[PDB]
């Protein structure tokens, strides 16, 4: 029972205990019988990694130089999980992923096979309604959903499980009732899982559902206070994110360019403060000199836009201040370490001005799994373009890591056309465009390299660290 299903893909199977060898062996056989390139087995139980710094360099030297496409583990309790999952963007999937992938003969979405028990929304395909939210709210809700293991879609389909709306005034509710299953919910559906770390059930679940009688702001505030307000009963899974002094001796200034729904600002404030940091909100009317002189411990600025005048004045007054966005905070929470922004990813800085339009950058992608799908869509978004689920003639670019798969074959053939030519280029073109703030040429040789799986440093997300 053989096939080409896993051609050119490298796997790392982590065995957490001696009793798992039978299953490790099973899984390896299925990978090898279905044409995996490399398949390493590493016994966690059989090597003392205590007092070894299991960081990115250590991982690339132990398990590289070629990229690991998938880690196969039914536990996240290994000391290089954060490096693998949050930095290198390698999916971590259960043994069941291999079994199900062989039976259905396609590369399955990885999210639902994550063994991270924080990934409470792993089974969710969620569309965030842009007509309900400002830009900053949209980014935040996307960050949290991704952090809870869910999938973001830019379209409503039969496969969409949840539509996020602010209120019953969102045009989309009416516009989809005309056309026509999936659930409308308030953003407190996402936030409750983040804060409490358990499935949302009972009366509180009902309070997160769209209610067409919530006709004023007052009724929304009241549901927000019932679902994520002063609970006083504890959060579950208290050891998943054990560093409760993560932001100790740090004080964040919050840009007025964020402009959150007030109860969302309370949630964000409460997040920073429960990790022992401090928050001062800046307003457009503030005299910035006296704010920063009145609270001289302020060491961090949180803003949406890199071109904000507040940020320009702030940098003038406070030249060594940390300059990050809301995504940066949650990345620090993911890593469980305060991390300067220069050691984080491009997407953790306040966003650059719009570089491209849709007409110049409507992109499809292929062979990007899990967090790499998230990362590529965020990057294309902040560049000013659109990213699509499928490859059509509407697409201006196909983004690819390698030469395998059917989308690459079709798109590479379409590149030979004379007039309306789709371009095939690698993900490093997106990253360098953003990093340099320039429309680089995708046909430069460095961006026509499609053998990026030979080096783990060419993983999407590593440009700019």
């Amino acid at each position: 029972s053989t096939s080409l299903l896993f051609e050119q893909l490298n796997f790392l199977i982590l065995v957490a205990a001696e009793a798992e060898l039978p299953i490790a062996h099973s899984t390896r056989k299925l990978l090898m019988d279905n044409s995996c390139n490399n398949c390493q087995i590493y016994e966690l139980y059989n090597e003392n990694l205590k007092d070894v710094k299991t960081d990115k360099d250590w991982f690339m030297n132990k398990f590289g130089p070629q990229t690991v496409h998938f880690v196969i583990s039914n536990t996240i309790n290994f000391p290089f999980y954060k490096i693998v999952y949050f930095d290198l963007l390698i999916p971590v999937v259960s043994h069941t992923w291999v079994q199900d992938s062989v039976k259905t003969k396609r590369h399955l979405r990885t999210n639902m096979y994550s063994p991270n028990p924080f990934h409470l929304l792993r089974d969710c395909q969620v569309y965030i309604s842009k007509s309900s939210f400002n830009k900053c709210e949209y980014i935040l809700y996307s960050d949290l959903l991704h952090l809870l293991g869910g999938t973001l879609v830019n379209y409503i389909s039969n496969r969409t499980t949840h539509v996020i709306v602010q209120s019953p005034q969102d045009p989309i509710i009416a516009t989809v009732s005309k056309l026509t299953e999936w659930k409308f919910v308030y953003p407190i559906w996402i936030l409750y899982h983040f804060k409490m770390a358990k499935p949302l059930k009972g009366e509180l679940a009902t309070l997160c559902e769209l209610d067409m009688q919530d006709t004023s702001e007052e009724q929304l505030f009241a549901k927000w206070e019932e679902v994520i307000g002063d609970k006083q009963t504890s959060s579950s899974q208290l050891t998943l994110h054990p560093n409760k002094t993560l932001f100790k001796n740090h004080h964040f200034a919050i840009s007025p360019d964020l402009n959150f729904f007030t109860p969302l600002y309370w949630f964000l404030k409460g997040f920073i403060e429960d990790l022992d940091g401090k928050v001062t909100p800046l307003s457009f009317s503030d005299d910035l000199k006296s704010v920063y002189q009145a609270f001289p411990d302020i060491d961090c600025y949180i803003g949406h836009s890199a071109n904000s005048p507040i940020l320009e004045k702030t940098k003038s007054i406070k030249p060594e201040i940390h300059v990050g966005n809301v995504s940066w905070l949650f990345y620090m929470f993911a890593l469980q370490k305060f991390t300067p922004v220069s050691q984080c990813k491009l997407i953790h800085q306040p966003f650059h001005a719009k570089l491209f339009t849709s007409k110049e950058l409507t992109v499809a992608y292929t062979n990007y799994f899990g967090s790499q799908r998230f990362y590529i869509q965020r990057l294309v978004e902040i560049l000013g373009g659109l990213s699509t689920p499928e490859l059509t003639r509407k697409n201006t670019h196909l983004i690819t890591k390698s030469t395998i798969g059917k989308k690459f074959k079709v798109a590479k053939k379409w590149s030979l056309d004379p007039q309306n030519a789709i371009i095939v280029t690698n993900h490093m073109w997106l990253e360098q465009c953003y990093m340099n703030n320039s429309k680089l040429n995708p046909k430069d040789s460095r961006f026509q390299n499609f053998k990026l799986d030979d080096n783990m440093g060419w993983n999407i997300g590593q440009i700019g660290m």
């Binding site: 007509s131 830019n154 379209y155 001005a353 339009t357 978004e381």
Partner: peptide
């Protein structure tokens, strides 16, 4: 197979 696909807003991420 989609149901609804919103029109893309070119300046959503920069609108004041």
């Amino acid at each position: 197979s989609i149901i609804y696909e919103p029109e893309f807003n070119e300046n959503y991420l920069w609108a004041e």
